[PDB]
Design a protein around this ligand. Structure first.
Ligand code: UUV
Length: 119
């Protein structure tokens, strides 16, 4: 029932993601010189360095907010891919599967802890 435990659990999960080769295209903002029309397609760019910085700045109140930003990395990849067989999109699908598998217990534990706090 530790209401704060999600933060370190999210830092460790972000460390795992950074070690994964599939995270390479998503570790820093999409390069607008490389993809000049990116902002015509994507309204809200997001990447794992921005997620890690928001977390370290104390600017996420819950793991749900972190999860919404991480999911935005994956939905941006899906929206910008010209094909469902592209390299970067294929990497995003595996990384999303890994992320969802690991974040489930973090979300569950946090929601359980908050319900106990207000019991
Ligand atoms: C890392 O992303 C670079 C921009 N982009 C390429 C595809 Br495919 C999807 N998004």
């Amino acid at each position: 029932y530790d209401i704060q435990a999600w933060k370190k659990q999210c830092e460790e999960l972000l460390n795992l993601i950074f070690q994964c080769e599939d995270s390479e295209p998503f570790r820093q903002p999409v390069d607008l010189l490389e993809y000049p029309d990116y902002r015509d397609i994507i309204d809200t760019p997001m990447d794992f360095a921005t997620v890690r910085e928001t977390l370290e700045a104390g600017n996420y109140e819950s793991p749900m907010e972190l999860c919404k930003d991480v999911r935005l990395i994956f939905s941006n990849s899906k929206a910008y891919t010209p094909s469902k067989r592209s390299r970067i999109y294929s990497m995003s699908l595996r990384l999303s599967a890994f992320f969802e598998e690991h974040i489930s217990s973090v979300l569950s534990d946090y929601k359980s802890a908050l319900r106990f706090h207000k019991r």
